Amino acid sequence: DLKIVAARMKSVKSIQKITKAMKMVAASKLRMDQRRLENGLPFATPVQKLVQRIPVDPKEKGTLAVLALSSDKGLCGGVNSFVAKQARIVIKENEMAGNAVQVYGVGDKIRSALQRTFGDRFKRIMTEVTRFPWNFGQACIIADRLMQDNPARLMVIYNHFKSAVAYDTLTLNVLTPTQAAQSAKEQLNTFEFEPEKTDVWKDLQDFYYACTVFGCMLDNIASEQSARMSAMDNASTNAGEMISSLTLRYNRARQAKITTELVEIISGANAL
């Protein structure tokens, strides 16, 4: 018919238009997110390197806690898919040995990905974080929530933002108080702690948690926006292709309608 094809063409044209607009919007947001990274990464790298001097083994047995960072909006490509894939891999690897696993998450997408399969392991989930600009106050809350539930070993899954068209999924084995007390911290003897080490360690550790969450979420946000732009590009292209096909079908149906109506009139005119 005609009304069907015309309605479909109208809808797909609107989709293409909105897709291009959202592409430009996501480009602007990616500029601002790259700025946020460039300003806020130096705040996080030093303490992370300082505590990473203490090597953490990821084979340690104990109550694992997996913090999976994700988004809340869709059309983000497939970054959350890869995050949840890595999380499933980690959970299925660590649950065989007998380590009781708990799951913390950021964003509704990881929740929708893992509800049916690993919903009997969630501990605390946060969302609506990407509404306002990311800030250190948002991260300190999550870090405090992690510390109040002090586990024996912590892992953090997120997406590293290599370039505007390339990301990379990673897993950070994060130090914990249980893993710190089991080490004499001989690697930090080169550093002169102005307060004594035993008095400043708990604060350095809380700062480490906060900075880790901060940097990880910034990288995930940037990767999300890059994937969003790519997805909008692909969607606009596919919409153009569908528009071409529907245009062909519309012209065919138009010609058919004209011919049919005219043949009806002529057959009614010659039967007199």
């Binding site: 989709i15 869709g74 490509g77 969607a235």
Partner: protein, 180 residues
């Protein structure tokens, strides 16, 4: 053409469909006279699936549980539900992509592609332009294979392992050979 108290005529009629239009008067009239139907499609033949049967437009009167068992009926209806749920996502997959879908929908898409490819048989007469030998398939093997694919006992296998294999033992052997 009709079975009577004297004898019986089974009939197998090939009905052309001009310009791929099933609303033409000829096939439209012919549909009313049939006890079983098999609607072939060009969209499915372009995917290399042969026989290019559209299992949703195809239907029959001998599918009720009072003729065939309830396991056959239930397997058929579950397969139809699966393929319809996959058809309902074609637009959103073409525009946006599989990433927008949830996990249940992704499992559905996987099983639907698998059961589409599994409903593809190499005939004996096609050996002249296909090369692969023919595969006669009994009914209980088909039903067991469909049950297993629907349950989730074949999600580990690939998608191109169901193409022109007949039963499931061939599918598993082909998956083994494809692992290399």
């Amino acid at each position: 053409i009709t079975t009577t108290k004297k004898g019986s005529i089974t009939s197998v009629q090939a009905v052309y469909v001009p310009a791929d239009d099933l609303t033409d008067p000829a096939p439209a009239t012919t549909f009313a006279h049939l006890d079983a139907t098999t609607v072939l499609s060009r969209q499915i033949a372009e995917l290399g699936i042969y026989p290019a049967v559209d299992p949703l437009d195809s239907t029959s009167r001998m599918l009720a549980p009072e003729i065939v068992g309830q396991e056959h009926y239930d397997t058929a209806r579950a397969t139809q539900k699966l393929l319809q749920d996959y058809k309902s996502l074609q637009d959103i997959i073409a525009i946006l992509g599989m990433d927008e879908l949830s996990e249940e929908d992704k499992l559905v898409v996987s099983r639907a592609r698998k059961i589409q490819r599994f409903l593809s048989q190499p005939f004996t007469v096609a050996e002249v332009f296909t090369g692969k030998p023919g595969r006669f398939v009994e009914l209980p093997e088909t039903i067991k294979s469909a049950q297993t694919i629907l349950r989730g006992e074949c999600d580990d296998l690939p998608e191109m392992a169901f193409y022109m294999c007949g039963g499931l033992e061939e599918v598993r052997s082909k998956a083994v050979k494809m692992a290399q």
